[PDB]
Structure 1
Amino acid sequence: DYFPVISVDLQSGRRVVSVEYIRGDGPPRIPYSMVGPCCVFLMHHRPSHEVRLRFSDFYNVGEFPYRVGLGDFASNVAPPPAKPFQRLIDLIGHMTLSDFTRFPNLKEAISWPLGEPSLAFFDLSSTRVHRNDDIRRDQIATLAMRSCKITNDLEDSFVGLHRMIVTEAILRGIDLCLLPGFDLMYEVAHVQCVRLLQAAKEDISNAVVPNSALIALMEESLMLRSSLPSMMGRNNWIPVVPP
């Protein structure tokens, strides 16, 4: 049906990876998987039709779930109990990058996982943004590839992105019941939200002038402190020296 084509091109004085899905049938590939809208062709992983709790429960044993995510089907990775930052994500996705890079700690918080500030995962996780499925799949695969900084393999990019998510969750004390690999863009945006909530403390401690970003983050922090403080992660954020 659709083949991913990975192309390394020069943009903004940086050589960056992109993925574009192109129509082509011939004989369709037999081993394949659907990670959200993205079609992945499995070279090193055996597709599996079992339903398991975590994405890692597949790729840790050399397998790959048949199909994952929301849709007119049954995901082979059982959905998380909740997506508790979805309101904050919807609120951030309608904001510009300059709202965060003006503050150092917020910039550092959203630097992960691409190594540069980026609100792309917030846009792809928001429910109040509407995009075609083709552009969505291209952007999701591109972000998975750009997180891992490789050029050739796409299934390993999704495995690496989930592994990065779980590593940051373990470091920041995020509960792993909420990050099973169901909707990888939401997991990245969730961990970025936890990092943002930890960074906003240092930003207000540095006596900055709140914009909409800090107002939203402080409202969320207040509500969470009242209801479920442990959801905000651990307090192990390195303050960023102001330039």
Structure 2
Amino acid sequence: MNSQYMFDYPAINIDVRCHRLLSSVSYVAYNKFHTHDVSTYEHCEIPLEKLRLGFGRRNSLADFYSLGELPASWGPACYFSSVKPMMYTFQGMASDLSRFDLTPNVLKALSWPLGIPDCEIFSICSDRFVRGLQTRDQLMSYILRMGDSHSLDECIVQAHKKILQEARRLGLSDEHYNGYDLFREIGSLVCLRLINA
């Protein structure tokens, strides 16, 4: 099956002492057919060990994992996206505080989604940041650390679920958060929480 070939494999290392810190995923050469299907997001290969491959052009990412499936490829990196493309606010603001480091209410507001204050999403959403082969490890590690699972696909599903939960809490509409760019959603939510308090 052509959909099972893997150029690189994500090796996950999880430390028991703290899941939100030092838990990482590296990428190693595979160059062979994997046992399961593969999903592509921002040049990142996710094995579909717990979810199944899906097809179509559904509007939201939730429309896929609500059926226990994941799209073959979605996000800005792909020319034609299974999810409906959309834009999020406060991207320029995120690029602005990309220079700001981790150094009261602001810390509690920015503690999301890890629960421990962090400012990596600002560097993620910065305009100087470019997506390629060198940024797979850090982005996938952030996704892994945000969720609580040993599988990347489950971590992505949980990340989108918590994004939707925070959007419900803050009163934003569901249709404006579909999962096209998870990290842009995280940055927009963090910026909204920061400006709120």
Question: Shared fold by TM > 0.5?
Answer: yes
User: What's the CA shift for 1:28?
Assistant: 4.1
Q: Contact between 2:47 and 2:153, CA under 8 Å: does it hold in 1?
A: yes
Q: Contact between 1:56 and 1:180, CA under 8 Å: does it hold in 2?
A: yes
Match of 1:136 in 2: 135
Amino acid at match of 1:112: W
Q: How big is the alpha-carbon RMSD for the aligned residues of Structure 1 and Structure 2?
A: 2.0
User: What's the CA shift for 1:133?
Assistant: 1.7
CA distance in structure 1 between the aligned counterparts of 2:63 and 2:83, rounded to whole angstroms: 9
Match of 2:176 in 1: 178
Amino acid at match of 1:145: L
- Superimposed CA distance per residue, residues 184-214 of structure 1 (whole angstroms, 9 cap, x where no aligned partner): 1111111111110111xxxxxxxxxxxxxxx
Summarize the alignment of residues 1-243 of structure 1 with structure 2, pairs less than 5 Å apart: 1-9=7-15, 16-29=22-35, 31-80=37-86, 82-98=87-103, 104-130=104-130, 133-150=132-149, 152-199=150-197
Structure 2 runs not aligned, ≥5 long: 1-6
Identity of aligned residues (%): 29
Give 3-state SS (helix, strand or coil) of 1:187's partner: helix
User: What's the CA shift for 1:11?
Assistant: 8.9
* TM-score, normalised with respect to structure 1: 0.72
Amino acid at match of 1:25: N
Q: Contact between 1:8 and 1:15, CA under 8 Å: does it hold in 2?
A: no
User: What's the CA shift for 1:9?
Assistant: 4.1
User: What's the CA shift for 1:50?
Assistant: 0.8
**Following TM superposition, where does structure 1 have runs of at least 4 consecutive aligned residues deviating by more than 6 angstroms?**
none
| Higher helix residue share | 1
* TM-score, normalised with respect to structure 2: 0.88
- Superimposed CA distance per residue, residues 126-157 of structure 1 (whole angstroms, 9 cap, x where no aligned partner): 22334x6233111111011111133x211000
Structure 1 runs not aligned, ≥5 long: 99-103, 200-243
Q: Which has the larger radius of gyration?
A: 1
CA distance in structure 2 between the aligned counterparts of 1:112 and 1:96, rounded to whole angstroms: 15
Amino acid at match of 2:145: R
Q: Contact between 1:36 and 1:183, CA under 8 Å: does it hold in 2?
A: no
Amino acid at match of 1:144: I
Amino acid at match of 1:5: A
